[PDB]
Amino acid sequence: RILTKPRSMTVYEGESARFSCDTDGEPVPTVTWLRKGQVLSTSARHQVTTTKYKSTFEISSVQASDEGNYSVVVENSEGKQEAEFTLTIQK
């Protein structure tokens, strides 16, 4: 599980904070980005997303959320895993 975890960083605002991880599953695992930042939103405030075997979350307009420690809990159609990191922001 957790084929690869997203590193970390510190951005200012919609400057990058790009993230992308990898995870196996059967069929395909599940992912839920979140970290006391309102589940890293998904589109109204963040460009979060997930693919067949690789997910990723980007921030081109961080809002109230985004403050530092940001993680991704990815299940496995039966199991549960997680990769935590820390992306802060400077409004």
mmCIF file of N, CA, C and O in Angstrom, residues 9-90:
data_model
loop_
_atom_site.group_PDB
_atom_site.id
_atom_site.type_symbol
_atom_site.label_atom_id
_atom_site.label_comp_id
_atom_site.label_asym_id
_atom_site.label_seq_id
_atom_site.Cartn_x
_atom_site.Cartn_y
_atom_site.Cartn_z
ATOM 1 N N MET A 9 6.406 20.959 1.907
ATOM 2 C CA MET A 9 6.951 22.286 1.466
ATOM 3 C C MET A 9 6.230 23.440 2.154
ATOM 4 O O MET A 9 5.428 23.264 3.052
ATOM 5 N N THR A 10 6.513 24.626 1.708
ATOM 6 C CA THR A 10 5.862 25.835 2.281
ATOM 7 C C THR A 10 5.661 26.863 1.168
ATOM 8 O O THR A 10 6.609 27.409 0.639
ATOM 9 N N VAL A 11 4.439 27.124 0.795
ATOM 10 C CA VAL A 11 4.199 28.109 -0.302
ATOM 11 C C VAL A 11 3.581 29.398 0.248
ATOM 12 O O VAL A 11 3.358 29.536 1.434
ATOM 13 N N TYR A 12 3.300 30.339 -0.612
ATOM 14 C CA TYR A 12 2.691 31.620 -0.151
ATOM 15 C C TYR A 12 1.197 31.640 -0.485
ATOM 16 O O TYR A 12 0.360 31.821 0.376
ATOM 17 N N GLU A 13 0.853 31.448 -1.728
ATOM 18 C CA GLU A 13 -0.589 31.451 -2.109
ATOM 19 C C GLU A 13 -0.751 31.103 -3.590
ATOM 20 O O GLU A 13 -0.337 31.843 -4.460
ATOM 21 N N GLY A 14 -1.355 29.983 -3.884
ATOM 22 C CA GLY A 14 -1.552 29.587 -5.309
ATOM 23 C C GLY A 14 -0.222 29.660 -6.060
ATOM 24 O O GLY A 14 -0.186 29.864 -7.258
ATOM 25 N N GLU A 15 0.868 29.503 -5.367
ATOM 26 C CA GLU A 15 2.195 29.573 -6.046
ATOM 27 C C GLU A 15 2.607 28.200 -6.563
ATOM 28 O O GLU A 15 3.365 28.075 -7.505
ATOM 29 N N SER A 16 2.103 27.175 -5.955
ATOM 30 C CA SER A 16 2.441 25.784 -6.396
ATOM 31 C C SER A 16 1.812 24.753 -5.453
ATOM 32 O O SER A 16 0.716 24.278 -5.679
ATOM 33 N N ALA A 17 2.501 24.392 -4.404
ATOM 34 C CA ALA A 17 1.954 23.382 -3.451
ATOM 35 C C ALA A 17 1.448 22.160 -4.209
ATOM 36 O O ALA A 17 0.568 21.452 -3.762
ATOM 37 N N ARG A 18 2.002 21.916 -5.353
ATOM 38 C CA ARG A 18 1.564 20.740 -6.155
ATOM 39 C C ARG A 18 1.887 19.450 -5.399
ATOM 40 O O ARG A 18 2.925 19.327 -4.778
ATOM 41 N N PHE A 19 1.010 18.486 -5.442
ATOM 42 C CA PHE A 19 1.270 17.207 -4.723
ATOM 43 C C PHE A 19 0.784 16.030 -5.567
ATOM 44 O O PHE A 19 -0.105 16.166 -6.375
ATOM 45 N N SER A 20 1.354 14.874 -5.380
ATOM 46 C CA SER A 20 0.909 13.689 -6.167
ATOM 47 C C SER A 20 1.491 12.417 -5.553
ATOM 48 O O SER A 20 2.683 12.309 -5.348
ATOM 49 N N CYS A 21 0.665 11.457 -5.246
ATOM 50 C CA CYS A 21 1.183 10.208 -4.633
ATOM 51 C C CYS A 21 0.806 8.995 -5.479
ATOM 52 O O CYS A 21 0.206 9.111 -6.528
ATOM 53 N N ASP A 22 1.144 7.830 -5.010
ATOM 54 C CA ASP A 22 0.803 6.587 -5.756
ATOM 55 C C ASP A 22 0.271 5.554 -4.769
ATOM 56 O O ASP A 22 0.687 5.524 -3.629
ATOM 57 N N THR A 23 -0.637 4.712 -5.188
ATOM 58 C CA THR A 23 -1.197 3.696 -4.248
ATOM 59 C C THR A 23 -1.813 2.523 -5.003
ATOM 60 O O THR A 23 -2.548 2.698 -5.955
ATOM 61 N N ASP A 24 -1.532 1.325 -4.574
ATOM 62 C CA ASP A 24 -2.120 0.143 -5.260
ATOM 63 C C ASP A 24 -3.495 -0.169 -4.668
ATOM 64 O O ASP A 24 -3.866 0.341 -3.630
ATOM 65 N N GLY A 25 -4.253 -0.999 -5.320
ATOM 66 C CA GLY A 25 -5.606 -1.336 -4.790
ATOM 67 C C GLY A 25 -6.154 -2.574 -5.499
ATOM 68 O O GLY A 25 -5.462 -3.229 -6.251
ATOM 69 N N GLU A 26 -7.397 -2.903 -5.259
ATOM 70 C CA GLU A 26 -7.990 -4.104 -5.913
ATOM 71 C C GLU A 26 -9.517 -4.135 -5.701
ATOM 72 O O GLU A 26 -9.982 -4.729 -4.748
ATOM 73 N N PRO A 27 -10.271 -3.510 -6.590
ATOM 74 C CA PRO A 27 -9.717 -2.781 -7.760
ATOM 75 C C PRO A 27 -9.427 -1.322 -7.396
ATOM 76 O O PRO A 27 -10.313 -0.590 -7.006
ATOM 77 N N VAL A 28 -8.197 -0.895 -7.545
ATOM 78 C CA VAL A 28 -7.822 0.513 -7.235
ATOM 79 C C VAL A 28 -8.151 0.878 -5.775
ATOM 80 O O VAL A 28 -9.199 0.535 -5.267
ATOM 81 N N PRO A 29 -7.235 1.570 -5.137
ATOM 82 C CA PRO A 29 -7.447 1.978 -3.730
ATOM 83 C C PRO A 29 -8.335 3.223 -3.660
ATOM 84 O O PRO A 29 -8.859 3.685 -4.655
ATOM 85 N N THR A 30 -8.487 3.778 -2.490
ATOM 86 C CA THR A 30 -9.316 5.010 -2.337
ATOM 87 C C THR A 30 -8.445 6.103 -1.719
ATOM 88 O O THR A 30 -7.435 5.817 -1.116
ATOM 89 N N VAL A 31 -8.803 7.349 -1.867
ATOM 90 C CA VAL A 31 -7.939 8.427 -1.273
ATOM 91 C C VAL A 31 -8.787 9.544 -0.660
ATOM 92 O O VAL A 31 -9.843 9.885 -1.156
ATOM 93 N N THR A 32 -8.323 10.122 0.416
ATOM 94 C CA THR A 32 -9.090 11.224 1.063
ATOM 95 C C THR A 32 -8.118 12.265 1.623
ATOM 96 O O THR A 32 -7.706 12.198 2.761
ATOM 97 N N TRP A 33 -7.744 13.222 0.820
ATOM 98 C CA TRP A 33 -6.787 14.276 1.298
ATOM 99 C C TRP A 33 -7.421 15.093 2.426
ATOM 100 O O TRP A 33 -8.577 15.460 2.350
ATOM 101 N N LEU A 34 -6.667 15.403 3.459
ATOM 102 C CA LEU A 34 -7.230 16.210 4.581
ATOM 103 C C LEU A 34 -6.173 16.423 5.672
ATOM 104 O O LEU A 34 -5.229 15.667 5.796
ATOM 105 N N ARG A 35 -6.337 17.445 6.468
ATOM 106 C CA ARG A 35 -5.367 17.711 7.562
ATOM 107 C C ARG A 35 -5.770 18.970 8.328
ATOM 108 O O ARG A 35 -5.102 19.983 8.275
ATOM 109 N N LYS A 36 -6.875 18.932 9.022
ATOM 110 C CA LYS A 36 -7.322 20.149 9.760
ATOM 111 C C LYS A 36 -7.390 21.334 8.786
ATOM 112 O O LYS A 36 -7.330 22.482 9.179
ATOM 113 N N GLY A 37 -7.517 21.049 7.516
ATOM 114 C CA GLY A 37 -7.593 22.132 6.502
ATOM 115 C C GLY A 37 -8.854 21.930 5.668
ATOM 116 O O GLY A 37 -8.893 22.235 4.492
ATOM 117 N N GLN A 38 -9.883 21.398 6.272
ATOM 118 C CA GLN A 38 -11.157 21.152 5.532
ATOM 119 C C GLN A 38 -10.910 20.175 4.383
ATOM 120 O O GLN A 38 -11.151 20.482 3.244
ATOM 121 N N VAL A 39 -10.433 19.001 4.702
ATOM 122 C CA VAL A 39 -10.149 17.945 3.673
ATOM 123 C C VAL A 39 -9.524 18.495 2.381
ATOM 124 O O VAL A 39 -9.846 18.044 1.301
ATOM 125 N N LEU A 40 -8.600 19.426 2.482
ATOM 126 C CA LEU A 40 -7.915 19.966 1.249
ATOM 127 C C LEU A 40 -8.916 20.201 0.120
ATOM 128 O O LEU A 40 -8.582 20.156 -1.047
ATOM 129 N N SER A 41 -10.138 20.468 0.482
ATOM 130 C CA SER A 41 -11.221 20.731 -0.515
ATOM 131 C C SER A 41 -11.098 19.791 -1.712
ATOM 132 O O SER A 41 -10.635 18.674 -1.585
ATOM 133 N N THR A 42 -11.503 20.224 -2.865
ATOM 134 C CA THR A 42 -11.396 19.332 -4.056
ATOM 135 C C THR A 42 -11.478 20.130 -5.362
ATOM 136 O O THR A 42 -10.877 19.767 -6.354
ATOM 137 N N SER A 43 -12.215 21.206 -5.381
ATOM 138 C CA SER A 43 -12.329 22.004 -6.634
ATOM 139 C C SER A 43 -12.747 23.441 -6.321
ATOM 140 O O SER A 43 -12.280 24.380 -6.935
ATOM 141 N N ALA A 44 -13.622 23.624 -5.372
ATOM 142 C CA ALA A 44 -14.062 25.006 -5.028
ATOM 143 C C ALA A 44 -12.886 25.798 -4.467
ATOM 144 O O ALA A 44 -12.805 27.002 -4.609
ATOM 145 N N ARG A 45 -11.974 25.127 -3.828
ATOM 146 C CA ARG A 45 -10.797 25.836 -3.249
ATOM 147 C C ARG A 45 -9.486 25.121 -3.607
ATOM 148 O O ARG A 45 -8.414 25.663 -3.423
ATOM 149 N N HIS A 46 -9.549 23.911 -4.103
ATOM 150 C CA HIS A 46 -8.291 23.194 -4.446
ATOM 151 C C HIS A 46 -8.482 22.325 -5.684
ATOM 152 O O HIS A 46 -9.572 21.899 -6.006
ATOM 153 N N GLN A 47 -7.412 22.051 -6.362
ATOM 154 C CA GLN A 47 -7.479 21.196 -7.575
ATOM 155 C C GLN A 47 -7.071 19.779 -7.195
ATOM 156 O O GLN A 47 -6.210 19.173 -7.802
ATOM 157 N N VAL A 48 -7.681 19.262 -6.174
ATOM 158 C CA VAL A 48 -7.350 17.886 -5.713
ATOM 159 C C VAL A 48 -7.851 16.873 -6.745
ATOM 160 O O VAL A 48 -8.711 17.186 -7.547
ATOM 161 N N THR A 49 -7.350 15.664 -6.739
ATOM 162 C CA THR A 49 -7.856 14.672 -7.736
ATOM 163 C C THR A 49 -7.286 13.278 -7.470
ATOM 164 O O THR A 49 -6.480 13.084 -6.584
ATOM 165 N N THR A 50 -7.702 12.309 -8.238
ATOM 166 C CA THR A 50 -7.188 10.925 -8.040
ATOM 167 C C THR A 50 -7.196 10.171 -9.373
ATOM 168 O O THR A 50 -8.066 10.364 -10.199
ATOM 169 N N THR A 51 -6.234 9.317 -9.594
ATOM 170 C CA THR A 51 -6.193 8.562 -10.878
ATOM 171 C C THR A 51 -6.210 7.061 -10.612
ATOM 172 O O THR A 51 -6.285 6.614 -9.485
ATOM 173 N N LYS A 52 -6.150 6.290 -11.658
ATOM 174 C CA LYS A 52 -6.168 4.803 -11.519
ATOM 175 C C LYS A 52 -5.246 4.340 -10.387
ATOM 176 O O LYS A 52 -5.682 3.743 -9.424
ATOM 177 N N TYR A 53 -3.972 4.597 -10.499
ATOM 178 C CA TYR A 53 -3.031 4.156 -9.432
ATOM 179 C C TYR A 53 -2.191 5.328 -8.919
ATOM 180 O O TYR A 53 -1.179 5.137 -8.278
ATOM 181 N N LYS A 54 -2.595 6.537 -9.191
ATOM 182 C CA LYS A 54 -1.800 7.706 -8.711
ATOM 183 C C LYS A 54 -2.715 8.908 -8.472
ATOM 184 O O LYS A 54 -3.409 9.354 -9.359
ATOM 185 N N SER A 55 -2.723 9.439 -7.281
ATOM 186 C CA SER A 55 -3.595 10.606 -7.001
ATOM 187 C C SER A 55 -2.759 11.878 -6.919
ATOM 188 O O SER A 55 -1.558 11.850 -7.092
ATOM 189 N N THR A 56 -3.374 12.997 -6.650
ATOM 190 C CA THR A 56 -2.589 14.255 -6.548
ATOM 191 C C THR A 56 -3.491 15.421 -6.189
ATOM 192 O O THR A 56 -4.665 15.464 -6.517
ATOM 193 N N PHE A 57 -2.928 16.368 -5.510
ATOM 194 C CA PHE A 57 -3.710 17.561 -5.098
ATOM 195 C C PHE A 57 -2.871 18.818 -5.331
ATOM 196 O O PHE A 57 -1.719 18.889 -4.968
ATOM 197 N N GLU A 58 -3.451 19.808 -5.935
ATOM 198 C CA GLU A 58 -2.686 21.063 -6.190
ATOM 199 C C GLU A 58 -3.435 22.251 -5.598
ATOM 200 O O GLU A 58 -4.611 22.172 -5.328
ATOM 201 N N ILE A 59 -2.771 23.353 -5.388
ATOM 202 C CA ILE A 59 -3.485 24.531 -4.814
ATOM 203 C C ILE A 59 -3.207 25.784 -5.638
ATOM 204 O O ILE A 59 -2.189 26.427 -5.486
ATOM 205 N N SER A 60 -4.117 26.149 -6.496
ATOM 206 C CA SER A 60 -3.921 27.377 -7.311
ATOM 207 C C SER A 60 -4.812 28.493 -6.765
ATOM 208 O O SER A 60 -5.113 29.454 -7.444
ATOM 209 N N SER A 61 -5.228 28.362 -5.536
ATOM 210 C CA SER A 61 -6.099 29.393 -4.909
ATOM 211 C C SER A 61 -6.411 28.994 -3.464
ATOM 212 O O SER A 61 -7.551 29.003 -3.043
ATOM 213 N N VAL A 62 -5.406 28.638 -2.704
ATOM 214 C CA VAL A 62 -5.641 28.229 -1.278
ATOM 215 C C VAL A 62 -6.594 29.215 -0.580
ATOM 216 O O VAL A 62 -6.497 30.416 -0.737
ATOM 217 N N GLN A 63 -7.509 28.697 0.192
ATOM 218 C CA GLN A 63 -8.476 29.570 0.916
ATOM 219 C C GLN A 63 -8.302 29.383 2.424
ATOM 220 O O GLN A 63 -7.220 29.108 2.902
ATOM 221 N N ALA A 64 -9.362 29.533 3.172
ATOM 222 C CA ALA A 64 -9.281 29.369 4.660
ATOM 223 C C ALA A 64 -8.437 28.142 5.036
ATOM 224 O O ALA A 64 -7.685 28.164 5.990
ATOM 225 N N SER A 65 -8.549 27.075 4.290
ATOM 226 C CA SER A 65 -7.744 25.858 4.606
ATOM 227 C C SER A 65 -6.288 26.077 4.187
ATOM 228 O O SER A 65 -5.934 27.141 3.722
ATOM 229 N N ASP A 66 -5.440 25.082 4.370
ATOM 230 C CA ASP A 66 -3.999 25.201 4.013
ATOM 231 C C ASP A 66 -3.315 25.988 5.094
ATOM 232 O O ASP A 66 -3.544 27.159 5.272
ATOM 233 N N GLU A 67 -2.533 25.309 5.858
ATOM 234 C CA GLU A 67 -1.846 25.965 7.008
ATOM 235 C C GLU A 67 -0.553 25.265 7.408
ATOM 236 O O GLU A 67 0.215 25.767 8.202
ATOM 237 N N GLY A 68 -0.323 24.110 6.895
ATOM 238 C CA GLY A 68 0.906 23.362 7.262
ATOM 239 C C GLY A 68 0.661 21.872 7.053
ATOM 240 O O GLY A 68 0.279 21.455 5.986
ATOM 241 N N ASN A 69 0.871 21.075 8.070
ATOM 242 C CA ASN A 69 0.659 19.592 7.953
ATOM 243 C C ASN A 69 -0.556 19.247 7.075
ATOM 244 O O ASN A 69 -1.682 19.526 7.419
ATOM 245 N N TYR A 70 -0.310 18.626 5.947
ATOM 246 C CA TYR A 70 -1.405 18.223 5.015
ATOM 247 C C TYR A 70 -1.192 16.748 4.680
ATOM 248 O O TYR A 70 -0.098 16.367 4.319
ATOM 249 N N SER A 71 -2.177 15.886 4.825
ATOM 250 C CA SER A 71 -1.892 14.445 4.529
ATOM 251 C C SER A 71 -2.901 13.839 3.557
ATOM 252 O O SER A 71 -3.787 14.499 3.068
ATOM 253 N N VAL A 72 -2.760 12.570 3.285
ATOM 254 C CA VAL A 72 -3.701 11.882 2.355
ATOM 255 C C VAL A 72 -3.982 10.472 2.864
ATOM 256 O O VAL A 72 -3.145 9.600 2.783
ATOM 257 N N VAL A 73 -5.151 10.223 3.365
ATOM 258 C CA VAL A 73 -5.441 8.836 3.850
ATOM 259 C C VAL A 73 -5.966 8.022 2.674
ATOM 260 O O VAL A 73 -7.032 8.281 2.158
ATOM 261 N N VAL A 74 -5.216 7.059 2.224
ATOM 262 C CA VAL A 74 -5.664 6.272 1.050
ATOM 263 C C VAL A 74 -6.002 4.837 1.456
ATOM 264 O O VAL A 74 -5.142 4.071 1.842
ATOM 265 N N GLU A 75 -7.245 4.464 1.351
ATOM 266 C CA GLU A 75 -7.633 3.077 1.715
ATOM 267 C C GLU A 75 -7.265 2.118 0.584
ATOM 268 O O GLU A 75 -6.591 2.483 -0.359
ATOM 269 N N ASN A 76 -7.702 0.896 0.667
ATOM 270 C CA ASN A 76 -7.378 -0.081 -0.398
ATOM 271 C C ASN A 76 -8.570 -1.011 -0.630
ATOM 272 O O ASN A 76 -8.468 -2.214 -0.501
ATOM 273 N N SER A 77 -9.706 -0.456 -0.964
ATOM 274 C CA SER A 77 -10.921 -1.296 -1.210
ATOM 275 C C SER A 77 -11.099 -2.349 -0.111
ATOM 276 O O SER A 77 -11.748 -3.352 -0.315
ATOM 277 N N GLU A 78 -10.535 -2.116 1.051
ATOM 278 C CA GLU A 78 -10.652 -3.085 2.196
ATOM 279 C C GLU A 78 -9.655 -2.703 3.291
ATOM 280 O O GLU A 78 -9.867 -2.957 4.461
ATOM 281 N N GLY A 79 -8.571 -2.103 2.911
ATOM 282 C CA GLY A 79 -7.540 -1.705 3.929
ATOM 283 C C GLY A 79 -7.548 -0.186 4.120
ATOM 284 O O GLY A 79 -8.393 0.512 3.598
ATOM 285 N N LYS A 80 -6.609 0.328 4.872
ATOM 286 C CA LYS A 80 -6.556 1.801 5.108
ATOM 287 C C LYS A 80 -5.106 2.253 5.312
ATOM 288 O O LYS A 80 -4.383 1.693 6.112
ATOM 289 N N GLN A 81 -4.668 3.262 4.599
ATOM 290 C CA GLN A 81 -3.268 3.735 4.766
ATOM 291 C C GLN A 81 -3.255 5.255 4.818
ATOM 292 O O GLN A 81 -4.292 5.891 4.832
ATOM 293 N N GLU A 82 -2.101 5.850 4.849
ATOM 294 C CA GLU A 82 -2.053 7.334 4.901
ATOM 295 C C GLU A 82 -0.626 7.856 4.750
ATOM 296 O O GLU A 82 0.325 7.282 5.240
ATOM 297 N N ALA A 83 -0.495 8.963 4.083
ATOM 298 C CA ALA A 83 0.844 9.586 3.888
ATOM 299 C C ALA A 83 0.761 11.047 4.327
ATOM 300 O O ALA A 83 0.132 11.861 3.682
ATOM 301 N N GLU A 84 1.350 11.382 5.438
ATOM 302 C CA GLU A 84 1.253 12.785 5.927
ATOM 303 C C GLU A 84 2.502 13.603 5.580
ATOM 304 O O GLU A 84 3.614 13.113 5.592
ATOM 305 N N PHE A 85 2.307 14.862 5.307
ATOM 306 C CA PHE A 85 3.440 15.778 4.993
ATOM 307 C C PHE A 85 3.073 17.152 5.553
ATOM 308 O O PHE A 85 2.284 17.234 6.476
ATOM 309 N N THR A 86 3.604 18.233 5.040
ATOM 310 C CA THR A 86 3.205 19.550 5.624
ATOM 311 C C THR A 86 3.403 20.692 4.635
ATOM 312 O O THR A 86 4.503 21.103 4.340
ATOM 313 N N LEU A 87 2.316 21.219 4.156
ATOM 314 C CA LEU A 87 2.372 22.360 3.214
ATOM 315 C C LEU A 87 1.785 23.587 3.903
ATOM 316 O O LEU A 87 0.600 23.648 4.167
ATOM 317 N N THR A 88 2.588 24.567 4.196
ATOM 318 C CA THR A 88 2.042 25.772 4.861
ATOM 319 C C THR A 88 1.718 26.813 3.803
ATOM 320 O O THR A 88 1.965 26.618 2.629
ATOM 321 N N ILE A 89 1.170 27.913 4.204
ATOM 322 C CA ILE A 89 0.830 28.970 3.207
ATOM 323 C C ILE A 89 0.986 30.358 3.837
ATOM 324 O O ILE A 89 0.841 30.537 5.030
ATOM 325 N N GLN A 90 1.305 31.338 3.042
ATOM 326 C CA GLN A 90 1.490 32.711 3.575
ATOM 327 C C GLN A 90 0.484 33.669 2.932
ATOM 328 O O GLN A 90 0.805 34.392 2.009
#
